Amino acid sequence: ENITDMAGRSVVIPAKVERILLGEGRLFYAVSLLEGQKPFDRIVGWQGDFRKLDTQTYAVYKAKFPQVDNIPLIGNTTADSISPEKVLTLNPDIAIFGLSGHGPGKNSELVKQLEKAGVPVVFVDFRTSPLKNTLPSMRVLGKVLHREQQANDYIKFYEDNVRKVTEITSKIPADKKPSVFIELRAGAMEECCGTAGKGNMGDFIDQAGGNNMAKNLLPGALGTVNLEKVLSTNPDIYIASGGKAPDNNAPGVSLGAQVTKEQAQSSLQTILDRKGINTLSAVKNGRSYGIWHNFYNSPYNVLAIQSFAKWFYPQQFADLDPNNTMNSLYSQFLAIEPTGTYWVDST
Amino acid sequence: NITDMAGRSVVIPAKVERILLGEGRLFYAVSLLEGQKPFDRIVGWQGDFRKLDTQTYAVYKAKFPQVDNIPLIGNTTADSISPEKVLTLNPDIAIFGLSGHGPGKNSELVKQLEKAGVPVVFVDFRTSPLKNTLPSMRVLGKVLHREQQANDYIKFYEDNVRKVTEITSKIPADKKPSVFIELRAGAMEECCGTAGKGNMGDFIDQAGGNNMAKNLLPGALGTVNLEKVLSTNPDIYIASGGKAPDNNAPGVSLGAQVTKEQAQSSLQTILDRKGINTLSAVKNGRSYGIWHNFYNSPYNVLAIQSFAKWFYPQQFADLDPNNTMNSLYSQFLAIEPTGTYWVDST
Ligand SMILES: N=C(N)NCCC[C@H](NC(=O)c1cccc(O)c1O)C(=O)N[C@@H](CO)C(=O)O
Ligand SMILES: N=C(N)NCCC[C@H](NC(=O)c1cccc(O)c1O)C(=O)N[C@@H](CO)C(=O)O
Ligand SMILES: N=C(N)NCCC[C@H](NC(=O)c1cccc(O)c1O)C(=O)N[C@@H](CO)C(=O)O
Ligand SMILES: N=C(N)NCCC[C@H](NC(=O)c1cccc(O)c1O)C(=O)N[C@@H](CO)C(=O)O
Ligand SMILES: [Fe+3]
Ligand SMILES: [Fe+3]
Structure with a gap:
């Protein structure tokens, strides 16, 4: 029995x-949809990105499962910090890697080492080409992890909840679509402004019937557009992504499992009060929003596609509630209770 | 025909x-129109300019001694104006303020003048400076036949204010400093006079400040208690005064005959008062003095600039209100600028 991965x-x-x-720690999100009430039972080790770049979701799982702290970290937050030696001594029987991200890619040496060791490697993708890859990735993970039922259940849930958006936005003509800019990890990078091109959260803008102003500025899924180019294009809708912890006074949007609506809106406002950004039409008109960054690499990304549609066409999606979808997702599939704020509107 | 400020x-x-002149200090608006002949067309005025602006008065007297012979229609209050002395001057126009030390729109004197066939014009630099200052000058221009001087002054004003507002209009509320302005600080019976939504409050708004009394008061002027100031503990403290140097009454010395030393020394007395002296703004040196009469004068662009430099020192490093003042005098007035109209604490 063989399967074709995302590479x-x-x-x-x-x-x-x-x-x-787990080549990238946050690939856990895909695994969590399959493992039911025993999420960490089969994880021999993972990249440190989930523990260090998702501290909030980590802490919630730790309180219910303290054994998560004992899963080995194969590296920090970059592919180059992974010791291939520590990896191989964990004697994995499967390795899950991402086409892109903070972990090894299809051409890394570690992938070749593992092939020499007789260890199957599976490439998934929620990051480069979410639209093409999210569902095929789950189908594949289902087959190789022997959780076909959970996977098929999640695909049905996903398709249905996305179809709620695409049934409407697929018929909208281009000239009625709002222009959109998404500023990834807004305020939190050295150089403004990170964003998504034809890929990553750009796929979500496309699906939600928006017009990504960076679609044709950038060759890749991720890249950089200068502040002045954003000001010049002056898009209808501004979106900032972040995952900053509540009690961090550094610049960035606070969103995640331990963030209250007050902290999400207070910190989004700081982001919107920055020189230049604050003269955007979208900011002045209040079409300014925050989305949790890690949706940029998670099959829970249907929550972001829905939040986008409701910001792109508020009345046409008045009746759609992403909080109900998150709650249906958690209760049906996960072993923790939903908390915190994964998206916010400016007031 | 024109529509006045009432x-x-x-x-x-x-x-x-x-x-x-219903209020003497309305002279300031007139002075911008009359060029080198300031007092030629004044039949009489309220005594507030002569008695509450002794410094600017003395400077004009030294160059124009005939100013002493302009009749005083009253002292410093609307109720002290004899309507009889007013009518025997046979004015052909009367200029009054919506508020202040002179008659308002509903006074008996205004009705008397209407019965006597005398045109009455209401201006305002005091209640709503932001809404009213420029419209007031436009109107004074038309009724006094000095449209050129008025239009020249409006252009000057707008340009010099726009230097501030083009920056501060884009600043978000959460980056603005909190400000308290204490009018005639030290000099009132009960502390502390200040401005609400109006008067010098308009200047704080324009200069990108956050007036702590904006929502404490219903009107343009009012009073807030010392303890309320201490409790709000604002970023920036500003005291207004116009006291003459050789006046042993309490208050801040500012005006045409005041040196920076006298201004600095007398501001310090004001800042050394119990309670005031523990303010964060005072201890941190964000404490300032502004000349009181800017509370009712189209020269108020000088205060808006002084506030902006105090509210954002580096963003307005290059802006100089002394140069704005010098340009104003040379272009419009008949005297030479002297004295200290603003001061920073040592
Ligand atoms: N800390 C580092 N120096 N690198 C992190 C590695 C991955 C890198 N990340 C991003 O470009 C990025 C951009 C916006 C928001 C994010 O969360 C990001 O992680 C990356 O993506 N590399 C690409 C190409 O280098 C890849 O591996 O395909
Ligand atoms: N590929 C790069 N060189 N920079 C982009 C990403 C690297 C780094 N990322 C994060 O810190 C991060 C945090 C939470 C979640 C993520 O997915 C992240 O990537 C980063 O942004 N570094 C800053 C330095 O402050 C920068 O590149 O400006
Ligand atoms: N000497 C008096 N009794 N009254 C003065 C007349 C005007 C009175 N002035 C003030 O309240 C005032 C406050 C702070 C600083 C100043 O320079 C002031 O003149 C006043 O404003 N009256 C109001 C209410 O009647 C008005 O004219 O509408
Ligand atoms: N509304 C009041 N009763 N008093 C406040 C204003 C009246 C008086 N004003 C002045 O002395 C004055 C001086 C220079 C410039 C001005 O605009 C002035 O108004 C005043 O302040 N009286 C004090 C006691 O002296 C007071 O009434 O608190
Ligand atoms: Fe990242
Ligand atoms: Fe007064």
Whole structure:
């Protein structure tokens, strides 16, 4: 029994899996949809990005599962910090990697080492090409992790909840669509402004019937557009992504499992009060929003596609509630209770 | 015909030569129109300019001794104006303020003058400076036949204010400093006089400040208690005064005959008062003095600039209100600028 991963490579499905290696820690999100009430039972080790770049969601899982602290960290937050030696001594029976991100890619040496060691490697993608790859990735993870039921259940849930948006936005003509700029990790990078091109959160803008102003400024899924180019284009809608912890007075939007609506809106406002940004038509008109950054690499990204549609056409999606979708998602699939703020509107 | 600041229609006289000033310090608006002949057309005025602006008065007297012979229609209050002395001056126009030390739109004297066939014009630099200062000058221009001087002054004013507002109009509320202005600080019976939504409050608004008394008061002027100031503990403290140097009464010395030393020394007395002296703004040195009469004068662009430099020192490093003042005097007035109209604490 073989399968085609997101890198086009054929992978032989292991008879039994009990030692999953996560190339990128936040790939846990895809795994969590399959493992039910035993989320960490089969994880031998992971990249440190989930523990260090998702401190809020981490803490919530730790309070219910303290054994999460004992899962080995194969590195910090970059592919280059992964020791291939520590990886191999964990004797994984499968390794899950992302086409892009803070972990090894299809051409890394570690991938070749693992192939020499007889360890199946699966490439998924929620980051470069979410629209093409999210559902195929879950289908594949289902097959190789022996959780076809959970995967098929989640695909049905996802397709249905996305179809609620696309049934409407797929028929909207281009000239009625709002222009949109998404500023990733707004306020929190050295150089403004990170954003998404034809890929990443750009796919969400496309699906939600928006017009991404960076679509044709950038060759890749991620890139950089200068502040003045944003000011010049003066888009209808401004969106900032962040995942900053509540009690961090550094610049950035606070969003995540431990963030209250008050902190999300107070910190979004700081972001919108920055020189230049604050003269945007979208900011002055109040079409300014915050979205949780890690949706940029998670099959929970249907929550962001829905939040986008409701910001792009408020009345046409008055009846749609992403909080109900998150709650249906958590209750049906996860082992923790939903808390915090994953998106916010300016007041 | 023109519409004054009270919404009333006034038939502009064909020729004006006998101007009555309901409030003496309305002279300031007139001075911008009369060039080198400032007092030529004034038949009489309220005594507030002569008695509450002794410094600016003395400077004009030294160059124009005939100013002493302009009749005083009263002292410093509307109720002290003899309507009889007013009418025997046979004015051909009367200029009054919506508020202040002179008659308002509903006074008996205004009705008497209407019965006597005398045009009355209401201006305002005091209640709503932001709304009213420029419209007031436009109107005075038309009724006094000095449209050129008025239009020249409006252009000067707008340009010098726009230097501030083009910056501060884009600043968000959460980056603005909190400000308290204490009018005639030290000099009132009960502390502390200040401005609400109006008067010098308009200047704080324009200069991108946050007036702590904006929502404490219903009117343009009022009073807030010392303890309320201490409790709000604002970023920036400003005291207004116009006291003459050789006046042993309490208050801040500012005006045409005041040196920076006298201004600095007398501001310090004001800042050394119990309670005031523990303010964060005073301890941090964000404490300032502004000349009181800017509370009712179209020269108020000088204060708006002084506030802006105090509210954002670097963003207005290059802006100099002394140069604005010098340009104003040379272009419009008949005397030489002297003295200290603003001061920073040592
Ligand atoms: N801390 C580092 N020096 N690198 C992190 C590695 C991944 C890098 N990340 C981004 O470009 C990025 C942009 C916006 C928001 C984010 O959260 C990001 O992580 C990256 O993506 N590299 C690309 C190309 O280098 C890749 O691996 O495909
Ligand atoms: N590829 C790069 N060189 N920079 C882009 C990303 C690297 C780094 N990312 C994060 O810190 C991060 C945090 C939370 C979630 C994520 O997905 C992240 O990538 C980053 O942004 N560094 C800043 C330095 O402050 C920068 O590049 O300006
Ligand atoms: N000497 C008096 N009794 N009254 C003065 C007349 C005007 C009175 N003035 C003030 O309240 C005032 C406050 C702070 C600083 C100043 O320079 C002031 O003149 C006043 O404003 N009256 C109001 C209410 O009647 C008005 O004229 O509408
Ligand atoms: N409304 C009042 N009763 N008093 C406040 C204003 C009256 C008087 N004003 C002045 O002395 C004055 C001086 C220079 C410039 C001005 O505009 C002035 O108004 C005043 O302040 N009286 C004090 C006691 O002296 C007071 O009434 O608190
Ligand atoms: Fe990242
Ligand atoms: Fe007064």
